Symmetry: C2
């Protein structure tokens, strides 16, 4: 029986995530929602009327301790969704403050940070945990699953494949040119040069696509909830004893950057083993070398912040 906490539960991402988790967490699970917005207990009440064997509670107020206590997995969707400087000034401090409390209430929890900019918020979290002297790099993750599902959808669409069965690895970071989909590794599929360029570009700018369709009035919230649910369930299955392989931004062996997204074997302690991403085409190797300066910069910004 695992307990999953969703921080920032009142926002669009948070509510989509909470709804899917109430429906998909294994029977007997516990789900805790926290958000300073006073509507939070009501979001939990709303969801508590759904007949699944998953207990749910919601907390508002200025203290997330009730949600964090005994939490096995903590999904951070605090702050505001996405210029670059504004997003950072709001979200960086919010993540740092949460991480500080997480370090004391549930330092053994697996932490999945959804809050952007992920390339930087994960390092912020890591440094806060280190100052507390409880940092376990096997338990800190930047949720990059949205890049993965978007890639599966777009590839499946272009090649008339079943979107539910298509696998598209994605490595690197979670923004702009740092998002590197490994189209060369897609099983059974072959892409032309223009298809590689077109798909890579769309995957890297997919967020903008949604914002524009909303005429500037919002961002990708439902698909982000979907992606975070998928990652959250992967963590929970791993904690319960099943071997799970997933793509995420973690502190690996550091051949390219202190933090880098690649496949990982998940287990009872979080990351069980950092798995090499495999062979890359020339386009992918050039893409990787061309975004490392940006990725390492995003990381330094987070280290310097703490």
């Amino acid at each position: 029986a695992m307990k999953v906490a969703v921080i920032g539960a009142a926002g669009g991402i948070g509510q989509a995530l909470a709804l899917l988790l109430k429906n998909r967490l294994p029977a007997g699970s516990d789900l805790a929602l926290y958000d300073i917005a006073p509507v939070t207990p009501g979001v939990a009440a709303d969801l508590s009327h759904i007949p699944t064997h998953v207990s749910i509670k919601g907390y508002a107020g200025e203290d997330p301790t009730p949600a964090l206590e005994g939490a096995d997995v903590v999904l951070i969707s605090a702050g505001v969704a996405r210029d670059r400087a504004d997003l950072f000034n709001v979200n960086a401090g919010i993540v740092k403050s949460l991480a500080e409390r997480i370090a004391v209430v549930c330092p053994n929890a697996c932490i999945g940070i959804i809050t952007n900019p992920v390339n930087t918020t994960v390092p912020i979290a890591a440094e806060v945990l280190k100052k507390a002297g409880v940092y376990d790099k096997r338990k800190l993750f930047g949720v990059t699953t949205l890049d993965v599902i978007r890639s599966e959808t777009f590839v499946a669409e272009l090649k008339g494949q079943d979107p539910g069965e298509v696998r598209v690895p994605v490595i690197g970071g979670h923004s702009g040119v740092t998002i590197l989909p490994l189209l060369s590794q897609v099983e059974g599929v072959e892409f032309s040069d223009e298809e590689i360029a077109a798909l890579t570009k769309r995957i890297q700018n997919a967020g903008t696509e949604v914002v524009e369709a909303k005429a500037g009035g919002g961002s990708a919230t439902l698909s982000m909830g979907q992606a975070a649910c998928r990652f959250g369930l992967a963590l929970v299955k791993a904690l319960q004893g099943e071997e799970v392989i997933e793509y995420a931004y973690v502190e690996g062996n550091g051949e390219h950057a202190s933090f880098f997204a690649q496949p990982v074997k998940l287990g009872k302690e979080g990351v069980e083993e950092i798995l090499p991403y495999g062979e890359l085409s020339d386009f992918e190797k050039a893409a990787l070398d061309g975004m490392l300066e940006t990725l390492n910069s995003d990381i330094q910004i987070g280290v310097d912040f703490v």
Copy 2:
């Protein structure tokens, strides 16, 4: 064949939850059209289109829902908002929608979520009649949220598996018109105190969520869950599967012209209006006691058209 489901009021809380669940659960090959006056609607569809499920999705914003209604097999209406000004608004919205439906997709199964359902369903029916296309087998007041709430509460109370507990609910969709048939719950025995507590909690569950939301919102996620269940049920039925559901429909009229009870869904919408079974004395007294209220809610709708 593939079915097309249209969600009217797709940008709101209920609507986005419904759309998310439909994108994930509709059978492969399905088409999903989202519509709402809110300018963000096309982006809600775009957001959802990024989910890897074999379900096509499009979104439209504007005053005219025609593109979403065109070729729709199922139309789920969740437009409006959650006193007299508010009713006039939702009534007007439902009336306008029914008018467009009469012209664009008169053969679609219509599921109304927009409250007050007791009144908005008759509004739609009266509009459809005036357009000469009313088919009472295809108009439903979605009362599914009352059913899943009842399932949840009974399960928690008697330590049952929530996914297995069955609790019929008849009557109307608001206050004293909501009648959970706790006497028909198999494998459990309720005390008089529990019967009273459960009934009161089921009838006032909407207020419970509004209060928990500090008065700045109502049930959206659970309502989306409920509408998804009813929506999928209609799709399965249109695809040839015998499905039994609880819904507010124009039945035999033993108690009110529109009344919620079990119905057998088929390829033409309502295939058969089924009896709701035996009632306990408490349930009968509750039924007798809501008649004046339910029929007046229907009257209010008829008067509006």
